Design a protein around this nucleic acid. Structure first.
Ligand SMILES: [Mg+2]
Ligand SMILES: [Mg+2]
Ligand SMILES: [Mg+2]
Lengths: 48, 48, 196, 202, 154, 140, 54, 145, 96
RNA sequence: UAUGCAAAUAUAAAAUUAUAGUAAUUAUAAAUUAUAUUA
């Protein structure tokens, strides 16, 4: 499977999934448009 | 083949597809044909 | 979004590692610089750094092309002015304003002609900037050292003729009349360098 | 008067040709062609009226000042006896529209629509002529004109007066008129921009 | 040491294409979505099952001008030079024949005189008529047909 | 609004983009359009996606049965490209889509070498043209 | 040739004795015709002028 | 006869099938069905650019009529050939003697000029063409060139 | 020289486009006023009743076509101080 | 201004200097620098 289906459930909006499962929702300015409602995950920031 | 001619008379030639596809009515046809000009080539990493 | 992808909020968006060490390069390309003017490296027109480039060397002769304002400039009416000059020089008893009328007609047209040519030329500047110019991004082709590799290819040849020996070597220049001033036994013409 | 140069003809671009059955060298002392074509009629008209040329039909009606199509239609209905009264005005309109551009009228738009749908679908492969017709007929639409106005607007083609005109065109609405004219999602833009749209297009 | 002005911001003329090429985004997005932690954008939901073409390669990577890289953007005459010379001669001997099919735009669902005439030209050649006489004969065919038509018109 | 520019390119900048009425190529175009809006894709990437999209086996050799120099007719392209903007909700007022896509083409019709473009300036890249000289732009 | 001719006295050490006679053989290009291939920028703009004035 | 559904005129079809199924992606029979089907429709079914004149046919309709007159519903080989024998006997003027286009069996050389040239390699060219071999009525003194 | 040639060709390739747009404009004038009219505007003698008018017009064209001798400008020679270039026809600095 | 003598950049190499013990390095190129007769 080269191109797997991934996450297919539309029961909420992309922005509601994003909101619940991701801290990334709290920082709307730090994310580009292509990734905006797309992340379900928490990200760590490390300043080198 | 010394003898086989019986078949030769009702025998069938193979059909002219090259000019039939040539002379098909086309949607790029022009009253007067102009050869395209030269396309941009790649002159190497410094020139592009 | 609201503006270019190669330009962010503070200036040109710094892709290569040269931009991060030298970030004067992002915000200043010269004295024709404005903020909307980053990422478009050419600046307006009639303006500093507005000149389009052709294989890296800028185009500063545009008027000279359409033959407006050049020494080689195209002249509209000659036959007229010559005719009228002839009239003036021949005699003073008869004065011909007929010639001066043909001429001033000619001029009256010439004005509009010229405005047309100028307009067409500015359209050429626009087209040349869009579809030809590299915006000063490619190496100069117009001076001999830029072609060094070419000359090298020739030096190499004259070396392989010489048994792959003397590179960049040339025949000793002899004298204005080396051939006829020299006695039997001495070289009267310049030899191949390897032959010395 | 003569040019500043006298040259021979510019060479003919590849792909470029003089259209078929089109006399390239024709002079005014040539004999009048028999048929009615924009060409034959315009050369004719040059011989008759001299140098009178009008951009469109309403410009002609401008120059004659108060002469409607049908009035002249009676002159021609007199001259050619077997014509109808309708065909007599039609003759005028067809002659004028050959000498100049075709008229812009609601009537002709309607006729065009009616023929377009009297023909229906066509045997063209992608229904080609039908997409032609459809794409054209939407150019004459109200909504399209509104859009043309907004586009010329975007380019700053108006002046102060146009603006105050748009303003007081807006003030004339009620909240009710807004609710009705916002239904179309376009027409309220037309109510505001009407005069300006009419100005650009005409 | 004088250099062309913008060499600082000069693009990489070999590699500046790579970043934007569809396959790259297919792979990257492919292993991004695979994570389970990314909601796939819809283009991916689509080209997932219609992946792009294989052998289209840039000219930057392959240094061949003559390589026709794209099935789409390709322009090469289907007309062999002999045909070109033939219908060009036919076309220049009469403008009517050339314009007949396409005066304004090309009407491509109707047959065209240029074509019909080329057909009956080849027909004449294989019955042994030489070049000149075959051409003038086909042209006479066209002209006589047109003569019929406009007699009717009159 | 840059969307209209993109669509102008897909319509006029591509020789022979197959039959654009067919539901296959049509869906390609639809999806890519909705992906240029909402910023999910670069214009360049979506364009190279469009021209590299899968159409039909032995494409060129079927193209020899229609086209001479490989230039198809541009009606199907514009009708599809307007259709997509209408069926997607792109504009608040329906007509605007078609009008703009049409208008931007008509203005470019007068330009020298109108349907060719330098590959660097054609789309988004580090260095750009000034807003007057951009190609299907409203400011030309 | 020019070398040999010179040392034999059949061609002058400077100058072209046939200069006028040879003009038929050279393509003298009239400013009135237009050769689509020229590096002459004057001729092009001249014909542009001409047609525009027409 | 409906022995098969599929026909094509495309050069080197096999390569195109290969490269088309390289660009394909999944193995689900939905996908497979469509890929195969689209391949078939776009090439092997004759939707476009095909005519009845152009397909190669031995049994072209007059021939069918003849066959059914001769060989249809005959209970032996013997009956078949006394039938045939009775058909050979027909005059050229009878109603029931019907004609058809015959396919010309192709010539070897295809043109008369080709005939001469082909014949000419088994022969010896003369040094001089036929019109100047015969000595002139005037006399040409042969000099050095 | 090479560089400026490759500039000239670009200019020219554009000016042939300009000239085309002009000729096209002329075509549009043709189908606005009709071909013959346009020809009239261009000096066609449709008013020439007899040959004497023709010979007047052609006498005019003759007196135009006859070329008065062109006096073509030759740039003066600039004498500078130590003469780095005695090719100097202008005051611009040169790279020796 | 090529009859004596005269190998020598066209690159096979291991951080700069230095006769191969001295000093601690050196070398390097596109940021920035107002007047060259264009409608
Ligand atoms: Mg500067
Ligand atoms: Mg220096
Ligand atoms: Mg600098």
């Amino acid at each position: 499977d080269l191109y797997p289906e991934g996450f297919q459930w539309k029961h909420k909006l992309n922005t509601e999934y994003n909101q619940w499962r991701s801290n990334t929702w709290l920082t709307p300015d730090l994310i580009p448009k292509e990734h905006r409602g797309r992340f379900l995950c928490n990200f760590q920031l490390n300043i080198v | 083949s010394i003898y086989a001619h019986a078949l030769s008379q009702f025998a069938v030639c193979r059909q002219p597809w090259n000019e039939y596809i040539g002379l098909l009515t086309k949607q790029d046809s022009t009253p007067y044909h102009t050869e395209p000009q030269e396309k941009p080539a790649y002159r190497g990493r410094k020139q592009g | 979004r609201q503006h270019d992808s190669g330009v962010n909020q503070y200036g040109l968006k710094p892709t290569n590692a040269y931009d991060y060490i030298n970030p004067t390069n992002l915000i200043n390309f010269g004295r024709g610089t404005t903020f909307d003017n980053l990422g478009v490296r050419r600046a307006g027109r009639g303006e500093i750094d507005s000149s389009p480039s052709h294989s890296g060397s800028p185009v500063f002769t545009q008027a000279k092309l359409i033959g407006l304002s050049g020494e080689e400039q195209l002249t509209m009416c000659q036959s007229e002015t010559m005719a009228l000059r002839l009239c003036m020089a021949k005699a003073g008893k008869e004065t011909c304003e007929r010639e001066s009328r043909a001429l001033d007609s000619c001029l009256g047209r010439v004005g509009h002609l010229r405005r047309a040519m100028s307009e067409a030329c500015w359209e050429f500047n626009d087209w040349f900037i869009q579809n030809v110019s590299d915006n000063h991004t490619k190496p100069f082709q117009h001076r001999p050292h830029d072609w060094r590799h070419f000359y090298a290819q020739e030096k190499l040849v004259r070396e392989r003729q010489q048994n792959g020996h003397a590179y960049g070597r040339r025949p000793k220049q002899f004298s204005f009349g080396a051939r006829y001033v020299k006695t039997d036994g001495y070289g009267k013409r310049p030899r191949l360098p390897y032959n010395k | 008067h003569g040019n500043l140069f006298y040259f021979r003809e510019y060479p003919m671009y590849p792909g470029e040709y003089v259209p078929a059955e089109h006399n390239t060298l024709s002079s005014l002392r040539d004999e009048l062609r028999l048929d009615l074509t924009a060409q034959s009629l315009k050369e004719a008209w040059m011989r008759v009226s001299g140098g009178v040329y009008f951009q469109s039909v309403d410009e002609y009606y401008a120059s004659v000042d108060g002469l409607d199509a049908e009035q002249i239609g009676e002159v021609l209905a007199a001259l050619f006896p077997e014509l109808n009264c309708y065909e007599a005005q039609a003759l005028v309109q067809r002659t004028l529209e050959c000498i100049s551009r075709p008229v812009s009228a609601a009537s002709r738009q309607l006729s065009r629509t009616i023929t377009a749908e009297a023909v229906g679908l066509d045997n063209a492969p992608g229904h080609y002529t039908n997409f032609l017709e459809w794409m054209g007929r939407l150019t004459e639409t109200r909504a399209f004109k509104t859009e043309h106005a907004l586009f010329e607007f975007s380019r700053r083609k108006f002046n102060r007066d146009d603006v105050r005109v748009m303003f007081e065109n807006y003030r004339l609405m009620s909240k009710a008129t807004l609710l009705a004219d916002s239904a179309d999602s376009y027409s309220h833009f037309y109510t505001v921009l009407k005069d300006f749209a009419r100005k650009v297009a005409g | 040491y004088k250099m062309p002005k913008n060499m600082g911001v000069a693009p990489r003329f070999d590699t500046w294409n790579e970043k934007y090429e569809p396959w790259e985004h297919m792979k990257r997005m492919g292993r991004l979505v695979g994570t389970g932690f990314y909601i796939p954008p819809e283009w991916y939901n689509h080209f997932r099952m219609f992946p792009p073409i294989n052998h289209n390669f840039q000219q930057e990577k392959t240094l061949n001008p003559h390589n026709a890289s794209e099935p789409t953007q390709d322009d090469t005459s289907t007309l062999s030079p002999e045909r070109v010379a033939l219908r060009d001669e036919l076309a220049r001997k009469s403008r009517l024949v050339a314009s007949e099919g396409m005066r304004y735009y090309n009407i491509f669902w109707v047959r065209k005189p240029l074509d019909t005439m080329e057909k009956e030209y080849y027909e004449l050649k294989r019955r042994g008529v030489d070049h000149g006489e075959a051409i003038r004969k086909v042209l006479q065919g066209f002209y006589s047909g047109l003569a019929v038509k406009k007699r009717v018109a009159a | 609004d840059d969307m209209f520019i993109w669509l102008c390119h897909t319509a006029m900048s591509v020789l022979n983009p197959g039959d654009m009425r067919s539901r296959l190529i049509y869906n390609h175009l639809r999806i890519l359009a909705e992906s240029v809006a909402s910023g999910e894709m670069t214009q360049r990437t979506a364009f190279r996606f469009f021209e590299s999209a899968v159409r039909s086996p032995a494409y060129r050799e079927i193209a020899k049965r229609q086209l001479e120099g490989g230039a198809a007719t541009r009606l199907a392209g514009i009708s599809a490209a307007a259709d997509v903007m209408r069926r997607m909700g792109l504009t608040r007022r329906p007509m605007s889509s078609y009008f703009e896509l049409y208008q931007r083409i008509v203005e470019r019709s007068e330009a020298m070498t109108p349907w060719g473009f330098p590959p660097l300036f054609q789309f988004e890249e580090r260095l750009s043209l000034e807003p007057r000289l951009k190609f299907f732009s409203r400011a030309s | 040739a020019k070398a040999q001719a010179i040392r034999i006295g059949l061609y002058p050490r400077f100058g072209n004795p046939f200069w006028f006679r040879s003009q038929k053989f050279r393509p003298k290009a009239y400013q009135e015709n237009y050769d689509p291939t020229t590096y002459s920028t004057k001729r092009t703009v001249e014909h542009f002028a001409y047609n525009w004035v027409q | 006869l409906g022995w098969t559904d599929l026909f094509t005129t495309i050069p080197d079809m096999t390569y195109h099938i290969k490269e088309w199924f390289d660009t394909t992606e999944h193995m689900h029979n939905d996908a497979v069905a469509w890929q195969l089907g689209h391949l078939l429709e776009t090439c092997f079914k004759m939707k476009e650019s095909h005519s009845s004149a152009m397909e190669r046919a031995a049994i072209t309709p007059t021939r069918a009529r003849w066959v059914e007159d001769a060989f249809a519903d005959q209970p032996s080989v013997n009956d078949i050939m006394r039938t045939l024998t009775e058909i050979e006997q027909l005059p050229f003027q009878s109603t029931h003697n019907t004609s058809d286009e015959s396919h010309i069996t192709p010539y070897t050389l295809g043109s008369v000029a080709a005939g001469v040239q082909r014949l000419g390699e088994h022969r010896l060219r003369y040094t001089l063409s036929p019109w100047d071999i015969t000595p002139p009525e005037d006399s040409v003194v042969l000099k050095h060139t | 020289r090479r560089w400026h040639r490759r500039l000239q060709k670009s200019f020219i390739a554009f000016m042939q486009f300009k000239t085309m747009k002009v000729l096209e404009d002329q075509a549009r004038l043709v189908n606005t006023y009709g071909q013959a009219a346009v020809n009239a505007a261009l000096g066609d003698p449709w008013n020439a009743t007899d040959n004497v008018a023709r010979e007047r017009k052609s006498a005019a064209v003759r007196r135009q076509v006859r070329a008065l001798p062109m006096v073509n400008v030759v740039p003066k020679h600039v004498a500078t101080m130590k003469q780095i270039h005695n090719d100097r026809f202008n005051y611009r600095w040169r790279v020796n």
